Write a protein that binds this ligand. Structure first.
Ligand code: NA
Lengths: 126, 5
């Protein structure tokens, strides 16, 4: 079965809204979310619907852009690196679980190319 | 095999 999704709410976690986090939502998330290959990454992997009974036996730090979107919109993060790490965890999980050349891997690679381009232009913290 | 196969 599916585990509980990653936390998007935690009142005693300290939160910030920085210019870098604003960029991560307005530029980085927005660019990847609208892409034709975004759909497998817009919500947690559903191991039941996709018939992947081993997915969460293997992937112990799941992450997806639906979770990231919620974290950004609900000001879950303290800094940009936390969010950047979530994106990189999402990509790494996909490359670890799946085989090279699979459709899902080609989709992640295209999203990751855009992610890297946008992260290269991350503004200096103000 | 494949995720969607
Ligand atoms: Na706070």
């Amino acid at each position: 079965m599916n585990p509980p999704p990653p936390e998007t709410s935690n009142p005693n976690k300290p939160k910030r809204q920085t210019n870098q986090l604003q960029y991560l939502l307005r530029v980085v998330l927005k660019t990847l979310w609208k892409h034709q290959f975004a759909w497998p990454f817009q919500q947690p992997v559903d191991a039941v619907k996709l018939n992947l009974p081993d997915y969460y036996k293997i992937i112990k730090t799941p992450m997806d852009m639906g979770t990231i979107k919620k974290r950004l919109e609900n000001n879950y993060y303290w800094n940009a690196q936390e969010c950047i790490q979530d994106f990189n965890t999402m990509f790494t999980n996909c490359y670890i679980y799946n085989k090279p050349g699979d459709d899902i891997v080609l989709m992640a690679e295209a999203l990751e190319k855009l992610f890297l381009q946008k992260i290269n232009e991350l503004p200096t913290e103000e | 095999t494949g995720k969607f196969l």
